[model samples]
Each structure stands twice: as C-alpha cells, then as structure tokens.
Target: TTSQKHRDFVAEPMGEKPVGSLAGIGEVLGKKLEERGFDKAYVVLGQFLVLKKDEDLFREWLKDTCGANAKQSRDCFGCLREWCDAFL
Candidate 1:
C-alpha cells in the first residue's frame, strides 16, 4: 500500500527532487536546511541513510539541524520514510 503523495514522489528519480518539494519544507525550513549544508533534497537523501532510519530519531535530528517544527519534521520524516519503504 501507498499514499498518493508517496506514489507521486517515489516515481521521480532520486536525485531530481528538491528539499523544498517535501511537504512542510517551505522557505523557512529550506533556508535553514541550506545554511546547515543541506541546500538540496539530495543532501537530505544521504542523511536519512546514515543518520537515523527510525522516525523519532530522524525527527529529533531535523529539529536540531534546522529547527523544524513538529509538523515540518513529521512531514519531512514521512516523505523520506515513505520513499525509504518504496525503494530501500
């Protein structure tokens, strides 16, 4: 099973999507992400691999790195996690 968002996102090739394309990763979070050296979605892609596959830990990392609010972290987590389940 998959969500519409999941289906849509995963279908795109890995390297093309922008971090800002992830839900809740709008201008504010995107700026923070870039300042933290994660200017693009590809950067975040690498983190979820080595950082934390688990939901809570990843969300915590997000807050620490970019001060992502609850929903922001959650949506970022979900976007990556769902992509994870699909591919990895």
Candidate 2:
C-alpha cells in the first residue's frame, strides 16, 4: 500500500513523533518499539547509525525486533537513509 503519503513522510526529518510516522511502521510495530524504548523515529535512526548504515543488519534487526517483513523493513531503512541524506 505504497503512497505519496509514505514518500512525503520519509522525505524529511521525523522530528519527534511515534514510530508509526515511519513509512512502513504501523500500530503493531510502533507499539512494540515503544515498549522496547524506541518510541521515536530518531531512536531507530540512532540504531541505524550505530550499525554503520548496514542495511542487512538493520533490516534483520527490525524484523526480529518488531516483526517487519522484508519489504517493510527495507522501505523503512530507505526512508531513514534518505532522511539522513537530507538532514544528517
């Protein structure tokens, strides 16, 4: 269910909000992340940075942590990548 809304959200900094604001994250993953102390998009961004932008590792971590599928994890990762390019 890709849409312009997803792209627009990913195109800029996430500021401070629930992880559900991420392109592929929904209530379920968002709640899981929040419960685990990764409530905000920037926290996930920190993980990405900590992983040195390793896509494979990040995607795997996301899946294991929050049950994101391959495409969902990749889309979220790509969103973070683009956000970094634009703002970080």
lDDT string for model 1 (38-88, tens) is: 877778878887875777888888899888999888877787877777777
TM-score of each: 0.81, 0.89
Model 1 error, position 14 (Å) = 3.0
Q: List the residue pairs that clash in candidate 2.
A: none
List candidate 2 stretches off by more than 4 Å. Answer: none
Best by lDDT: 2
**Model 2 lDDT per residue over 10-59, tens place:** 67668886688887888888899898989998899899999999999999
Collision pairs in model 1: none
Scored by CA lDDT, what does every candidate get?
Answer: 0.77, 0.85
